[PDB]
Write a protein that binds this ligand. Structure first.
Ligand SMILES: Nc1ncnc2c1ncn2[C@@H]1O[C@H](COP(=O)(O)OP(=O)(O)NP(=O)(O)O)[C@@H](O)[C@H]1O
Lengths: 298, 15
């Protein structure tokens, strides 16, 4: 049957970003207090809070060097709504202060939460896939996220995926195949091969980073620095381990609930590897990844 | 690469 991929919120009727006063966020974080801290950060610290509306938010205090990550976020996630993208609700810009206020996502990031069975994990892979295809295939210019990872997948009340952290994000004209940057930005164990060779990002880069995050869901392990790995990231630990046995790489917890999903779990691993191809052009688009997951389920 | 993906399909077929 025929799917329509993107039928999320019409933007014209959507709540605009609320420009928030500093004093407001200062009071609600109880003084940007350490106990109100959720996120010790690359680009800022993240404070849990409740506004004067009663609405739960997560506030990102961005660190002022002597405002690119602010503007990266305003120009991309601040312009768009989708069920699988975190809702940026408002912002604050005073003097040299740049704050970003998000809807608070009840179960925090996926990494922290890794308390969820297989049906719940595939719901996370698919929903996280869908949100990355939004960025690639349904925005123009395309959005290249440039930092996909477990801690950048948040989880709501119903445990659906919500792609997060757009501080790295970049707009790329639909007419272009790549975009040229200045530095190598990434999170260790997530960085695609060709980014080490060139200062260029692409949507195909995001596809690589995506697959790693699929392994995390398959195997239940961190992407780097776990006891079994030895020398390599889990891209290496999955790639070599295979010939020995494939089904051993899977998270015990999934396998333990049922011997019947042994096969449903293998095919999802075929998708993840395809994303992890060393030649960008051979990788599925986030839209092909979605069809891959849907074929599997019939 | 080709090997790895082929290896995975071998496995799936078997099961
Ligand atoms: N809207 C939100 N709702 C709930 N939790 C959030 C929200 N935004 C951020 N977080 C939390 O903040 C953490 C991520 O902060 P952020 O800087 O945006 O990403 P990050 O990758 O973890 N940064 P870092 O790991 O230090 O390089 C996650 O573990 C979440 O617990």
């Amino acid at each position: 049957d025929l799917e329509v991929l993107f039928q999320g919120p019409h933007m014209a009727f959507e709540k605009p970003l609320r420009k928030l006063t500093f004093a407001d966020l200062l009071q609600a974080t109880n003084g940007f207090h350490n106990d109100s801290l959720i996120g010790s950060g690359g680009f800022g610290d993240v404070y849990k809070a409740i506004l004067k509306d009663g609405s739960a938010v997560a506030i990102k205090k961005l660190i002022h060097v002597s405002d690119r990550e602010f503007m990266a976020e305003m120009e991309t996630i601040g312009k768009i709504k989708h069920r699988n993208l975190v809702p940026l609700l408002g912002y604050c810009k005073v003097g040299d202060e740049r704050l970003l206020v998000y809807e608070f996502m009840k179960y925090g990031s996926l990494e922290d939460v890794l308390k969820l069975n297989w049906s719940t994990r595939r719901k996370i892979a698919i929903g996280s896939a869908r949100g990355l295809a939004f960025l690639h295939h349904n925005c123009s210019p395309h959005i290249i996220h440039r930092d996909m990872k477990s801690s950048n997948v948040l989880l709501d009340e119903n445990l659906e995926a919500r792609v997060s952290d757009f501080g790295m994000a970049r707009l790329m004209s639909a007419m272009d195949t790549h975009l040229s940057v200045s530095t190598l930005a990434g999170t260790p164990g997530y960085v695609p091969p060709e980014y080490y060779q060139s200062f260029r990002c692409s949507t195909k880069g995001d596809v690589y980073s995506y697959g790693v995050v699929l392994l995390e869901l398959l195997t239940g392990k961190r992407p780097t620095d776990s006891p079994d790995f030895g020398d390599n990231n889990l891209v290496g630990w999955v790639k070599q381990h295979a010939k020995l046995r494939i089904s051993d790489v899977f998270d015990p917890e999934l396998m333990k609930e049922d011997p019947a999903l042994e096969i449903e779990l293998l095919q999802h691993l075929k998708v993840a590897v395809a994303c992890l191809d060393d030649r960008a052009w051979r990788r599925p688009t986030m839209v092909q990844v979605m069809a891959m997951f849907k074929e599997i389920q019939a | 690469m080709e090997e790895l993906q082929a290896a995975i399909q071998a496995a799936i077929a078997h099961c």
